[model samples]
Target: MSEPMMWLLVRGVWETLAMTFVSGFFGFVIGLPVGVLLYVTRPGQIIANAKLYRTVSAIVNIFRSIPFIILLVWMIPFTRVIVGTSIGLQAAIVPLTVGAAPFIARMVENALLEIPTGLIEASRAMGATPMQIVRKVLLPEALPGLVNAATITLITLVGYSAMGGAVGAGGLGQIGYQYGYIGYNATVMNTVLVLLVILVYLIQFAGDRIVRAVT
Candidate 1:
């Protein structure tokens, strides 16, 4: 590869890492609280307002699980408004965070949901305050899953960051497209693919280690 070619690849790697992780850092900030609120506001939950929660769920679905590319375009206006452009590292961060929020919420809510309801009842019988149960019972029980949720979200962003390349986020996706597939360079394609696989493994290994330790 030429020097400039290698430079692009290096930047590609850098962009991919920053977008994946920075957005991954995004995991709990909005999503965690939204998911927790979903639970707390469920039909019989502490605050029990299913209708309002459903409205929020509707909004989540709108921005929630749509295709990343679709979001890249759908959220273009705001991306420009928020990040000052619609096609780079920070720009992609805007799109990914919005898209990932619902998924993260789903993960966390399910994690909390999996806890045996009997535990909540037992805690209530003990006169445990709602906050106490949230901190002591719910959080402890859901620890592994929440960490796993973040890990999975991190891994998910790696892929989305590549998708950002389609619109111009400039990562391995661009590397593969500009130098590999479109260029008919098999070596480059394989190299980038293997590189991505290694990233996924690193995230998975660390997350599993933490979950194992917690469990």
Candidate 2:
């Protein structure tokens, strides 16, 4: 590849990685707690509270049900207000985080829920506080699933990054769209697709191994 083309590729990949990791990190942070709350505070669960759990569960469903592309466009004004421009990688993060966090949260809750009641009882009998149960029993027992959830989140973030292309967010997806679809450059399209496929498969494979090991 020529120098300028190479530079563009590098810059685009960097932005894509940044957008993916940043949004994924935020999603994990927000979602992990929400998931724990959902699992713990359900009607008859460990720290059950029907009203609170219902309210939060409703919110998670609301966000997760929205199509990500719509969320990206819907948040343009908010993105602009936050970044002074809603057409870059950073701006794209607004919608990405908003869209993905709830999904991650739900995944987390499910993972935690899968932990056996016996294990929870055993931990409690040992005088574990809720926090300790979560940290020691819940999290440790559910870690493999959580790791798998994270891997899935990372994979989903890749797709969300592609949607960010609509806002001119610079990433491999944007490059493929602009050059391959509009610019009619088949070569760039193929290259980016191949790269993304490889990256995604590697993550999925690694995640599978981690899940198996954890379980």
Candidate 3:
């Protein structure tokens, strides 16, 4: 007989979805500007600012360096300040967004960096300002790459949803950890892993198709 409490499982899945999507949305929004700044203000880029760039880069690395599990614990104080508690879905969002933003910034930077330098120079020669070039030339040129990167980020966020569950951000991962690891239910653990793999591959396949079409 199956012992997966159907109601709890359903609720767990929804919690995971909410945690993952909300975090990813906020992370992407915050990271978009941060990432653009990182790219456009690099040493050789349009709005080079060594001081600002170094400060932002260092901040990104700090967040990125902290392991997710440790970050969850470390962020409890901040989480309590933001969500009034450090043990629920609301609390989970803070750490998730913080963790995801730095990663997405790196992704956005990679995508933007891949744009041909000549394309940018050509835009500059045509009298485009930094803002205009980013809006017209750089962003358009890197659209395909950004799409692929976004898809990858979304899938990554799904995996992160599991980690978020460590702090009562309930999801499949929490279920796996609590039941599989703690309870020693290998079957339950395997099931969650299978779902995760499927979700990842499904998004990846779609991203590949979109990238191919766009390019």
Ranking by lDDT: 1, 2, 3
- Which pairs clash (backbone N, Cα, C closer than 3 Å) in model 1? none
* Residue lDDT tens for model 2, 1-215: 45688678777777777888898888888778788888978887877788897789998899999998888888887888987876888778778888999998889988778877788778878997888887777788889889988899888888888768746687887887888766677777777788778878887898899888876
Task: Give candidate 2's whole-model lDDT.
Answer: 0.82
What is the lDDT of every predicted structure here? 0.82, 0.82, 0.82
Estimated TM-score for each candidate? 0.92, 0.94, 0.90
- By TM-score, is 1 or 2 better? 2
Off by over 4 Å in 3: 1-4
RMSD of each: 1.7, 1.5, 1.9
**lDDT (Cα, tens digit) per residue for candidate 1, span 1-215:** 45576666677778888888878667568888889988888887787888898798788777675888898788888788887876778778878888888889878888889888788889999998999999999999999888888788999888988888877777887787766555678767777788889878998999899989999
How accurate locally is residue 157 in candidate 3, as Cα lDDT from 0 to 100? Answer: 77
Per-candidate clashes come to 0, 0, 0
**Residue 86 CA error for candidate 3 (Å)?**
1.9
Show where candidate 1 strays beyond 4 Å: 1-4
Error of 3 at 20 (Å): 1.9
RMSD in Å for candidate 2, one decimal? Answer: 1.5
Report the candidate with higher TM-score, 2 versus 3: 2
- Candidate 2 wrongly placed segments (more than 4 Å): 1-3, 213-215
Pairs that collide in candidate 2 are: none
